[PDB]
Amino acid sequence: GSVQIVYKPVDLSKVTSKCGSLGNIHHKPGGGQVEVKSEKLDFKDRVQSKIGSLDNITHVPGGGNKKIETHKLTFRE
Amino acid sequence: GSVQIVYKPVDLSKVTSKCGSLGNIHHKPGGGQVEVKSEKLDFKDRVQSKIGSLDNITHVPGGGNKKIETHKLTFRE
Amino acid sequence: GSVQIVYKPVDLSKVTSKCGSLGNIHHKPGGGQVEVKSEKLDFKDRVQSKIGSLDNITHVPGGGNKKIETHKLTFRE
Amino acid sequence: GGSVQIVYKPVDLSKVTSKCGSLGNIHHKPGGGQVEVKSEKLDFKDRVQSKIGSLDNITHVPGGGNKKIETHKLTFR
Amino acid sequence: GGSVQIVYKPVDLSKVTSKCGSLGNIHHKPGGGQVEVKSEKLDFKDRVQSKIGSLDNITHVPGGGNKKIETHKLTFR
Amino acid sequence: GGSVQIVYKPVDLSKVTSKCGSLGNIHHKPGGGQVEVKSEKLDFKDRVQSKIGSLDNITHVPGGGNKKIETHKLTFR
Numbered sequence: 001g002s003v004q005i006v007y008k009p010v011d012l013s014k015v016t017s018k019c020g021s022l023g024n025i026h027h028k029p030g031g032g033q034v035e036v037k038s039e040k041l042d043f044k045d046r047v048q049s050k051i052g053s054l055d056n057i058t059h060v061p062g063g064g065n066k067k068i069e070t071h072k073l074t075f076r077e
Numbered sequence: 078g079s080v081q082i083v084y085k086p087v088d089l090s091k092v093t094s095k096c097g098s099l100g101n102i103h104h105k106p107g108g109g110q111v112e113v114k115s116e117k118l119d120f121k122d123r124v125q126s127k128i129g130s131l132d133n134i135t136h137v138p139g140g141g142n143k144k145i146e147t148h149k150l151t152f153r154e
Numbered sequence: 155g156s157v158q159i160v161y162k163p164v165d166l167s168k169v170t171s172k173c174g175s176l177g178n179i180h181h182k183p184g185g186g187q188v189e190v191k192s193e194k195l196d197f198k199d200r201v202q203s204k205i206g207s208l209d210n211i212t213h214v215p216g217g218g219n220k221k222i223e224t225h226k227l228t229f230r231e
Numbered sequence: 232g233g234s235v236q237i238v239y240k241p242v243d244l245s246k247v248t249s250k251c252g253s254l255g256n257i258h259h260k261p262g263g264g265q266v267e268v269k270s271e272k273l274d275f276k277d278r279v280q281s282k283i284g285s286l287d288n289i290t291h292v293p294g295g296g297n298k299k300i301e302t303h304k305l306t307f308r
Numbered sequence: 309g310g311s312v313q314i315v316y317k318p319v320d321l322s323k324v325t326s327k328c329g330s331l332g333n334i335h336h337k338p339g340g341g342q343v344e345v346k347s348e349k350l351d352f353k354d355r356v357q358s359k360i361g362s363l364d365n366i367t368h369v370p371g372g373g374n375k376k377i378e379t380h381k382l383t384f385r
Numbered sequence: 386g387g388s389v390q391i392v393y394k395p396v397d398l399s400k401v402t403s404k405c406g407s408l409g410n411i412h413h414k415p416g417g418g419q420v421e422v423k424s425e426k427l428d429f430k431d432r433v434q435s436k437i438g439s440l441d442n443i444t445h446v447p448g449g450g451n452k453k454i455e456t457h458k459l460t461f462r
Contacts, residue, residue, distance in 0.1 A: 118196070
């Protein structure tokens, strides 16, 4: 008797992430008038301020993507 | 008797990431007038200020993307 | 008796990242008038200030991309 | 009187690990109040250690603050 | 009186791990009250350790704060 | 008198590790309040250690603050 082994696997797989803002249409988007008026204010501690008519923010810590293979042929241990 | 081993695994796989702002259309996006008026204000600690009509921000710490293989053929330990 | 080994693996795989702002169309984007007026203000600590009609920011700490193989043929220890 | 044989052969392959996506936006304002100390006719006949103060402060923000501590000891007779 | 054989051979494969997506937006304002200390005619005949103060503060924000602690001991006769 | 044989041969391959994506935006404002110390007719007949002050402060922000500590000890008779 005699022995033949044909270890011949094939991988065509896809492992893909699409994260954030994709394929959107924003058509004539119009921020309104922003009108900030201020008198005689006291700030005795940290001020953080953000003023604006129309902001787009995309933040992506995610979309992290991975593939692992580990495979072996053992003949007589 | 005799032995034949063929070890011909094939990989065509795709491991991919698409993260942030992709393929978007921003057609005539209009910032409104931004008008900031201030009088007699006392600030006695850190001021952080950001004034603007129309901002696009994309921040991507993510989308990290990895592939691992391990293969072995062992014949008689 | 005789032995034949054909260790002949093939890799055609792809490992790719697309991170940040890609393929976007910004058609006649218009920042509004930004008008900042200030009188008699006291700042007794650090001021950080950013003023402007129309800003695009892309920041990408991410998109980090890697591939590993490790492979061996072991014959009789 | 027969022989004494001691083999002391520990194996450590262990991991202490940390992954953090972001660490931040920390606002810390520790405040000591007034301290008053008054003292009359006190007698000390041995070592004095004294500390007086309104604030003792530690702010510790490591990107990873992991510990491995090991003692390996062998004592014969 | 026969021989004595000791084989101290531990094995450690352990993992202590952490993953955090984000750690942040922490606002901390510890406040010490007023402290007043008055003292007359006290006698001390041995070591004095004294601490006086309105706030002691530790603020500790590690991105991962993991610990492995081990003692390996062998004692003979 | 029979032999004594000691084979102190530990193996350490262990890892203490950290990944942090970003570390920052820390606002720290420690405030020491007023300190007053008054003292009359005190007698000290051995060593005096004294510390007086409104603030002791440590700010520690390492990109990684990991520790490995090991003690190896062997003691004979």
